[PDB]
Write a protein that binds this ligand. Structure first.
Ligand SMILES: *[C@@H]1O[C@H](CO)[C@@H](O)[C@H](O)[C@H]1NC(C)=O
Ligand SMILES: *[C@@H]1O[C@H](CO)[C@@H](O)[C@H](O)[C@H]1NC(C)=O
Lengths: 49, 99
């Protein structure tokens, strides 16, 4: 519930998780995407590629 | 007390049971390096490489923590090599194992 006297929104980490348009008042939350790191599972080079 | 001749010997006994908790594995998170450090940005791939491949010495070890987590729960519980089962009739000479 957004009280109609605030302007911005920031959960934590200075994350400005409230973006609103002057004409219409809507609240929103911002989070980084899923994303993933990688690792290669290789048997012996001399065995197979 | 004591002198040149004395000793104490028990006459009765009492079986006792006591727990001993022990951590074995910990829920392992898989946190990546780029997104966290830098999300989707045009300069994300250029300024990131100025330092080098330090993410190689960052995410390489995190997976090792994860794998070692299950190796801890494999050697602990999977000691016996065959899975047994108690007889259908519970008759152990008076002992109760229902708990
Ligand atoms: C890998 O395979 C090659 C065969 O070309 C062999 O000469 C070498 O000793 C092997 N190395 C290992 C570590 O098995
Ligand atoms: C068990 O211990 C009690 C004292 O707690 C003792 O009086 C009794 O003799 C012991 N049991 C036997 C079989 O002696």
């Amino acid at each position: 519930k957004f009280l109609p006297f605030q302007q911005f929104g920031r959960d934590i980490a200075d994350t400005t998780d409230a973006v609103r348009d002057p004409q219409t008042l809507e609240i929103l939350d911002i989070t980084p995407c899923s994303f993933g790191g990688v690792s290669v599972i290789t048997p012996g080079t001399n065995t197979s590629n | 007390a004591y002198s040149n001749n004395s000793i104490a010997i028990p006459t009765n006994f009492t079986i006792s049971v006591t727990t001993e908790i022990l951590p074995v594995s910990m829920t392992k998170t898989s946190v990546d390096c780029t997104m966290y450090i830098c999300g989707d940005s045009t300069e994300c791939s250029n300024l990131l490489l100025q330092y080098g491949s330090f993410c190689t010495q960052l995410n390489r070890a995190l997976t090792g923590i994860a794998v070692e987590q299950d190796k801890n729960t494999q050697e602990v519980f999977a000691q016996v090599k065959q899975i047994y089962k108690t007889p259908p009739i519970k008759d152990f000479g008076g002992f109760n194992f229902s708990q």
